Amino acid sequence: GGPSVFLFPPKPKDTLMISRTPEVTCVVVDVSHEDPEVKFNWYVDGVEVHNAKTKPREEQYNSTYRVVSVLTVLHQDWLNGKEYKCKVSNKALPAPIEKTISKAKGQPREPQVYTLPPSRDKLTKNQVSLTCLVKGFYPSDIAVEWESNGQPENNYKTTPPVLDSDGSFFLYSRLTVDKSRWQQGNVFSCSVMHEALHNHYTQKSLSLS
C-alpha cells in the first residue's frame, strides 16, 4: 500500500476551557520520499472549511515522512457534536482516504464527585491515599486534578474511565500525601472538568475533622 491516516480529537481540557484553543489533528504516516505531496480537504458537517494549517514536514528515519494538518475547532461546535472530516489525497493512494471524528454520541451526563478520606489502617504509614470518585458522567472526556491552598498537588494517578452498568463512566483519582500533611488539617481539593458540569467545573475538598 501507501500512506496511512490517523485523525485525533481535541484535548478534553482544551474544549472545556474558554481560555484554551481546541484543535482536530489529521496525521498522515508512510508518506513516500518520491511523492511527499499531500492534499488535505477538511469538512465540518459536510461543509468544506479552508482554515486548517499544515505543520512542518517531519522525516521519521524509516524512509517515510509525517505530514500533519491541524484544524482549530470552536468549543461549542465540538461540544454540540459536529463531525470533522479529513480527506487525504496522495499519488501513492488508489483513492482518497477519508477519516471522521466527533465527540461520543449520547446525552451528556453530569459527574458526581466524591472525595473519600484515607482508611484508619492507612493512617499508620509514612504517606496516606486521598481518593476522588468521579461517577455517572457521559461522555468519558474529563480532566481530573488536585490542589491544596491554591497550589497544584502533582503526586496523583488517575484510573482510566470504566464503563458502568448504567451506560455512564466512572474513575478514581488517588493523591498520595505525607501522613503529617494530612494529620495537620490541610485541605486537599479534587478539581474536575466535564462538559456536563455547571461552567464545566467542580471542586470537592477533603480534610481531617
Binding site: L16, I18, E145, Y201
Partner: peptide
Amino acid sequence: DCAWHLGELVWCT
C-alpha cells in the same frame, strides 16, 4: 457566574 481553575478561566454562564 464564572468558574476558575488555578487562576485560569474555565467558563461563564
